[PDB]
Amino acid sequence: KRLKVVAAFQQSGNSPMGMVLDAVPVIPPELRPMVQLDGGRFATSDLNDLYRRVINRNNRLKRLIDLGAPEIIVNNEKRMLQESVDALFDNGRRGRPVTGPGNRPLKSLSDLLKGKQGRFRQNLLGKRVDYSGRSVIVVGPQLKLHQCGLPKLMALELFKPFVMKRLVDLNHAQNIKSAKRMVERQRPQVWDVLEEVIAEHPVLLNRAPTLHRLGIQAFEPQLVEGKAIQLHPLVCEAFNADFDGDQMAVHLPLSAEAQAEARILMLSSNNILSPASGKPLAMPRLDMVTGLY
Amino acid sequence: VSQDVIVREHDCETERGINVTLAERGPDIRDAHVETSAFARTLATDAVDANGNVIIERGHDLGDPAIDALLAAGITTVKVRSVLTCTSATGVCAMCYGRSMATGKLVDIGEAVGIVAAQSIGEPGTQLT
Amino acid sequence: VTSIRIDGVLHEFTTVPGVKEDVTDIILNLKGLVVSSDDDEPVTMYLRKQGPGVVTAGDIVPPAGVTVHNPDMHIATLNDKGKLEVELVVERGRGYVPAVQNKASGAEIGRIPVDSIYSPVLKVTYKVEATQRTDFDKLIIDVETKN
Amino acid sequence: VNFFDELRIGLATADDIRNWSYGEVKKPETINYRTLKPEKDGLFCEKIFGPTRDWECYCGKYKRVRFKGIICERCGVEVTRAKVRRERMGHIELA
Amino acid sequence: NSVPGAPNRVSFAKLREPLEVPGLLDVQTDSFEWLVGSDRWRQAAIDRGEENPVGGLEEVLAELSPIEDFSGSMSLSFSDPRFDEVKASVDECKDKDMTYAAPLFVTAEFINNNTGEIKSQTVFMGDFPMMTEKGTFIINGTERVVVSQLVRSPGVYFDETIDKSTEKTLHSVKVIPGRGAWLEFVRIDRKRRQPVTVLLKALGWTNEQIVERFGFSEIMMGTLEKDTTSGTDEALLDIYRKLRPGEPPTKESAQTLLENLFFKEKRYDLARVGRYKVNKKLTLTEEDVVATIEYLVRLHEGQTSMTVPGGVEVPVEVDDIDHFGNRRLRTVGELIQNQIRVGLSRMERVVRERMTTQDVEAITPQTLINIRPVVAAIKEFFGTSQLSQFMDQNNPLSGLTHKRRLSALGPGGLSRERAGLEVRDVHPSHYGRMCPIETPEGPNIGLIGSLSVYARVNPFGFIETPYRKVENGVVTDQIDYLTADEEDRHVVAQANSPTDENGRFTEDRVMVRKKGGEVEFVSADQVDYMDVSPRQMVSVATAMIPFLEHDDANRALMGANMQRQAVPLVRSEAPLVGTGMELRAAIDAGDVVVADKTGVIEEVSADYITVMADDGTRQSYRLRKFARSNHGTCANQRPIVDAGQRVEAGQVIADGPCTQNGEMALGKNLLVAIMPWEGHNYEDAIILSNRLVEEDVLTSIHIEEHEIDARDTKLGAEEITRDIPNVSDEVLADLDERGIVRIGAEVRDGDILVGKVTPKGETELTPEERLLRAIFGEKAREVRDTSLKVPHGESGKVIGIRVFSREDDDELPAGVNELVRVYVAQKRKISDGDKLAGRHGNKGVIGKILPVEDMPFLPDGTPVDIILNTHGVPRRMNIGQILETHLGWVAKAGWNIDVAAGVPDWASKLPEELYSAPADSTVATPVFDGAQEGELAGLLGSTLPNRDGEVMVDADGKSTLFDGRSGEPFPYPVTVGYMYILKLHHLVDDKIHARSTGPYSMITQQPLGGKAQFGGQRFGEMECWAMQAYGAAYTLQELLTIKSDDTVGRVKVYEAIVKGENIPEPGIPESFKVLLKELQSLCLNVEVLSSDGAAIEMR
Amino acid sequence: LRVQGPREVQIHLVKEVQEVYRAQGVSIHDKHIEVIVRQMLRRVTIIDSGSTEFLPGSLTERAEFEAENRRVVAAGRPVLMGITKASLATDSWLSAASFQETTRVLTDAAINCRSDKLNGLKENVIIGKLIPAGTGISRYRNIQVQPTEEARAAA
Amino acid sequence: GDFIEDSEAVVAVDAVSFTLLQDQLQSVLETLSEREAGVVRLRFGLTDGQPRTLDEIGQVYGVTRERIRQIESKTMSKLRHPSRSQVLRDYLD
DNA sequence: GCTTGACAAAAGTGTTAAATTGTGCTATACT
Ligand SMILES: [Mg+2]
Ligand SMILES: [Zn+2]
Ligand SMILES: [Zn+2]
């Protein structure tokens, strides 16, 4: 085992000296911001109090060195300096963690990367996105398999930049500023325009949790009255969708490639069989059984 | 663990495979599951009855008719292509992977079958008591 | 009846001094009004009552060309301090039209829009009896109206 | 560019750390308690990390995009986008 | 029943309540009255029990008195707590954002032992938050509830765990105190490798005493025989280095270490619970630490009886931590006491040290006392503590169960993640104390529960249940409240066992519960106590489910939870088929107006109700009107009485939000048809008659609160004003002078509520902007526009306005000149997408609403209101919902006997006076004695007419519905009836969100989620998996770059859509650039290399 | 494994896994299970170098072991390892970091001075590249489209 | 920390309309005399971004500051003329 | 189509007073 570390340093050009720090980097300020909330009260990152202990202790150390001081005092400073740089990088990894008011440990540099709330899982492997919405879902029994009911208010906001252009093309609005207000106030002219842009322009529907890829499918949006989402009754199996009040997210593919992938790859009617057993999924169930039986 | 496994090529051409049981010992009676084992595969070698006539050639899809046809000739096993024996340098090959459960046809060359496998396995996990 | 205006109140969610019913529970009562109008065009009714008592639809003074067909209906119960001054606008139409918000109409802050039910008919059913071979069909329909 | 090939790691040496740094922050100070402006030589110092406003130095003698990439001879702040405040690092020299 | 104004609701109960339900808000008021120890609690503990009642406040004050330094030269003594009248009224506090509190006063006596002088001074501790009549607190204006916590009572508990290796038996005992280090058998302070014998000598007992006391214990001798410690002081040294490693000891420190750790009262806290637990079961006494080890050795040996060497005999047996005899339940008074104790101890520190550096004879009770830590404990307890919660009120029931909730989480208890499923499971001792059927569905299951109906809390913190003691097969009127310990002592007869004449056992044998608890069947001979009634185990909400006994515990739990989820309707109709509790749950909730003296009504206004008592006194009650509740429901009240009316004490003068005529109404009675209908009601969906819209039967109001303040800014003062820098006079059209929306106005999304302005500069306007200024002559204004507008997707009428100004005296935190709150309200018609449900756990969204014209309609032409799908019913074990659907029809249409000549066989067991009820009469079927299947059928035939003498439903509860679409009948008879369905607080208006562009996060440029921020949807790890399985690379890239993190790309894509150009190529996600920066800050050198040229720079 | 050899462990593991799911009534085609089982057998323990460049007890990829072991003109045994331990062995260091035990991974990566080629799809997700699967594969994304001269004529 | 908006973040609809406004001005200016447009640009610093004093613009065209002040007033009443201004109205803010 | 001189506002510039900020110190004895 000990060889694995000693060997690693030979092949790489890394000087093992790197494991001891003469200098500590300082992260840019906007990544550890200090800002005033609405009302003026201030909030800042824990990183700054952590950086503050380090620099405070380093500066005291310089002071004691220059006066001359018994090793007891000086060595005590170096021990404190060592612990403060530990808390900065990894807090609580050794000893009790540095805490703030209420005794809650401060978040270290390591706390950024790690965990479900760290950079990787929170901000990297997933993230929040533009051109999306959600609502509660209701049954679509009159829908064709490739279609979905989309609340017209929801559709309007999702497609807002599209219609803004369209109603400037048609002369409804003279400039983009007027187009934007026309959509916000929901002046009646926009609706006819919305149906234009939304035509044959697909959208992805997702219900959490997403177990298999069939948990996301593309449909053909249909403007619908009301604030709910009309879901075709044959896709409930794949989404595992209960109408007990489940909600679903809508995503608007933008680029030509994204729309192509929606129509071809993810379209509802092209995904019927489960891609596990090959058995049919969209096959009738419940009511539809007893009706045909 | 499986996310980087995607179909990289049509055929690695290996003759290697795995032996599927395809029932046995009757009548004197399909194996309870040939649907998740023998079906959707592709034959590694020709399936030959005594003495015999080669009822199905290597590379056949092995649908429902093929199992009936084979069963008549009295073949109690078949050697099949699998991703376990696939020799592809990167990823796996379509022929070894076999039919796409979604399309019902030979898997497409872009398919990422690791993720699909991961999900196909984990999804029912909720139903596992 | 489309909208209503009450002097004291600027909106639906307050009370009135001395009145037992809040303005919203009074609007509910006024829903049960069954009126009829030659129309056309909107016409305002008027109601004013003072001192104790009980207000009812009879206390509504209709303009010329309209009538209230169930004056027996309870609106609000007033006490010594209770005073109720309210005008009501009767329009003409069919079906059920949800209250038209005065931001969509041209109304000012005072007007209280109300849901309007124009449905003379109350409850309706039917049944049939054939006319054995040669059977025909004769249907009876049971029609009831609100008066 | 959006297409890179390799992405590598290694131990950062003190010299690597010093080369990244746009200055050594010498004070445990964030912002002034009255003006709420970044304190010089502290964390957030505009001399090292960058300008709070686009093409605006701390004191303001050079306020304009006309001269980008010049440093104010008074406050020592560089005239450029405040975005660099997101990209720039300091260092501490330990005793 | 027994309530003066109680409406007439007929019951099928075949038993008689021997005991009225206790006041079910009591658990909160008693705990608090003990803490403050008002005379109401004084009389209680004087007229029974101990003769020296000590209030919680005095109790913690006894612990402090006196304060004496090591010298004992000065002593600071406390005594005699006092409260003044409450500062402001509850209504005033909720308005002004203050906390409802009485100032507390204390007498502080400081004595100088050298000079013998006394200084007596009255001291002000602080404003001590009080408890409302309703059992709540007002903390900074918001009504809050303190939930009672479940904890392990102090005591000695033994556990037998089989060896993971040898399989041999082991104990394994533990002793948990109020405070101080805990010991386990001597493994102490989490220090292993400690023999139990080495410490027994540490007290100074010589080995022969071990051989004398150990006696029959073989491992007791072998442990001392194996132990190498020679001498009592040498063993203290082996204990000293393990307990205090790093410190060389001293004979003064070696001895006092053990003495100070436990025996000393300061460091080790004897608990009244712990003191009582072990004193009977066997501060800390040396006598007690010996009996511990003695109990243990006599456990592993297998003997059931231990007679102490000088003590009294008790059973030697294992203890169960989940048995309620060992589990409290720290109530609100105690949760406050503990937080006060902490505040005082922190002050004692400053009182002790203060004495030293203060010039002597210049010290007074005040100079030593600094009250900062005492009030901080209270203020910091109500805020930030998990046991102090914002009261849950969308309906009286939700509020009533929030109080009475007991949870095992919080400080002083286990964390939600660590505790296993053994604590979540229902114990046999929960019977009649904690309702098993009610808990959360989330991963709080079993950690949170509601106190039962007749359960009552003990002064020591153990729950008691009422019982009626039986003697010689005769059940007396004696009602004795027993704890879990004394319940294991006896045999509890089943609540319903046949009663005999004047009363006695009729049935040959008796249903009984043993101490297992293990059920058994024995004759009337051996019983002691019997149950007070069915539904002792049940909670209030659970007791409100008609036909509870027919529904699986799964759907029942959902049913209870969802009743507290309903929302008050404008009309508030009461349930046609109810249970017992509806009456008494509404009055005890406090959301209904009850009269406290018999008399007559002088006035009835919507605003207030006055009653002239027979006493000559005059009581008046102001009515809550359209009051916004915590979560936005409506608290509106209405008077149910008329001027002349006579009234009696405890009657109901006015209805609350969810009540009608005194009983809880959480929903409406609707005409239900259980046929599947054209694929519309499917997979739990529901369809509705448009009637429920036109007639506002499911309508409910809602009120939102909007807030803005004008503060002092470094660049000036913020000013509320009507002048906005750039607007049309149209937007301002609804603003008054000061710039706040006018009352009664209609407001859409984005409309201005309160105009505000803040200074700005130096501006440096863009040249293109400065040119238009010259052309159109609009001076660039001195200040930015920061103004209050209505959130996206909201609307309503402006109800009321509240303004707090610094110019006006008012009050405000430093820097805030003016505060204005605007209250917007809206009527919400029942809408497709809203969630409805019944009491049985049956829930679903509204999937469609049809014109009353085309709906299944009865032969009368009477349309059905709801069509429920047939398929969801059978598999869910909720069939109680079908029963009440039948009864609902019965209660609506009336019925008759069944007589003459005689009463039929089924009615014999027996409906009494129930033989006839008119149309629309309301029914009550108490849970565990309700109507019975036989009695339903007999009633199912009854009674015509619609109007004409024809009958609309058969003895099967079915009818022939005509399709309102084609006009032809439906081929088969369909079940119809009336069901009680509630409107639930999940609404489409609130749950519909959409975003194209919006705010982005500061550190990461990602859109920020939540409706408040106008946020976007999270595309998660699992969603990306699905995207990858599809093989859509361009879709996946898009979502993760130009739709979230790409700062240049997201503005470009917008530029492209608006110009109809092609969507551009994506850039680098900002989050990744951040990751590199965060790794650099760890001294990780991360370089992005191309094929070459080596290092690329992110910039 | 040691008894019946690498290909037999696979047959076993598929049967065993497939038995649990069969008990509960779930239908999974064996190939999905095989894809996962294939990833547990992909490495071998290095007993001797001998002139490598490899270290005893280390787990190295079978293909990478075979090629460099040739070295023109170093023995190992088949290795079974669980899915978690297997994924940590992946050559992508930022893929391993995002998975689990982030601090352990980053510290070993910085010492070994590890270079990530960014071949895998999770790596490309993190940096915003086009995953090398489906439509992101080179052969598809480099498709060139033009109308036939026959089509342009008809206009 | 993740509930904090970024107030300096670029808003796409404004940057695009600002791009569109920058287009309409370039057009409206083309309806002015070469020197009339040239004076407005330098006066407000359209091209450079640095505004100029009347004396400075007089230095490029070889006139007094007062002459430039005059030419400024005229072209501004020409710009205020409705046919030119009608299109820029919706850009008020 | 443009320039001149009188002129006041506006903008800098240096000079001074006020305020703000930093540091030293406090001697019964106290560990
Ligand atoms: Mg669900
Ligand atoms: Zn292959
Ligand atoms: Zn400067």
Author numbering:
A (entry chain D): 294 to 586
B (entry chain D): 879 to 906, 910 to 1010
C (entry chain A): 51 to 181, 185 to 200
D (entry chain D): 4 to 98
E (entry chain C): 21 to 205, 215 to 311, 323 to 1139
F (entry chain D): 1123 to 1195, 1202 to 1283
G (entry chain F): 374 to 466
Give verbatim lines from the article:
Rifamycins, an important component of modern TB therapy, target the Mtb RNA polymerase (RNAP), the enzyme responsible for all transcription in the bacterium. In bacteria, transcription initiation occurs when the ∼400 kDa RNAP catalytic core enzyme (E, subunit composition α2ββ′ω) associates with the promoter specificity subunit, σA, to create the holoenzyme (EσA), which directs the enzyme to promoter DNA sites through sequence-specific recognition of the −35 and −10 promoter elements by σA domains 4 (σA4) and 2 (σA2), respectively. Initial EσA/promoter DNA recognition triggers a series of events as the enzyme unwinds 12–14 bp of DNA to form the transcriptionally competent open promoter complex (RPo)34. Recent mechanistic studies have revealed that mycobacteria RNAP exhibits unexpected differences in basic and regulated functions from those of Eco and Thermus.
Previously we described a 2.76 Å-resolution crystal structure of M. smegmatis (Msm) EσA with RbpA and bound to an upstream fork (us-fork) promoter DNA fragment (RbpA/EσA/us-fork), focusing on the roles of the essential transcription factors RbpA and CarD in the initiation process. During refinement of the Msm RbpA/EσA/us-fork complex, unaccounted difference density appeared that corresponded to an αCTD bound to an A/T-rich region of the promoter DNA from −29 to −24 (A−29AAGTG−24). The αCTD structure was built and refined previously but was not addressed in the earlier manuscript. The location of the Msm αCTD and its relationship to neighbouring molecules in the crystal packing environment indicates that the αCTD belongs to a symmetry-related RNAP and is bound to the DNA adventitiously (αCTDsymm) in a non-physiologically relevant position of the promoter between the −10 and −35 elements rather than the physiologically relevant position upstream of the −35 element. The structure of the Msm αCTD is essentially identical to the Eco αCTD (r.m.s.d. of 0.586 Å over 40 Cα’s). All of the αCTD DNA-interacting residues are conserved between Msm, Mtb and Eco, and the αCTD/DNA interactions are essentially identical, including an ordered water molecule that mediates interactions between Msm/Eco R259/R265, N288/N294 and the DNA. The striking similarities between Eco and Msm αCTD structure and DNA interactions raises the possibility that αCTD/UP-element interactions play a role in mycobacteria transcription regulation. The Msm TIC structures show that β′i1 spans roughly residues 140–230 and folds into two long anti-parallel α-helices (β′i1-α1, residues 141–186; β′i1-α2, residues 191–228). The Msm TIC structures contain full-length σA, and clear electron density for an α-helix extending from the N-terminus of σA1.2 was observed.
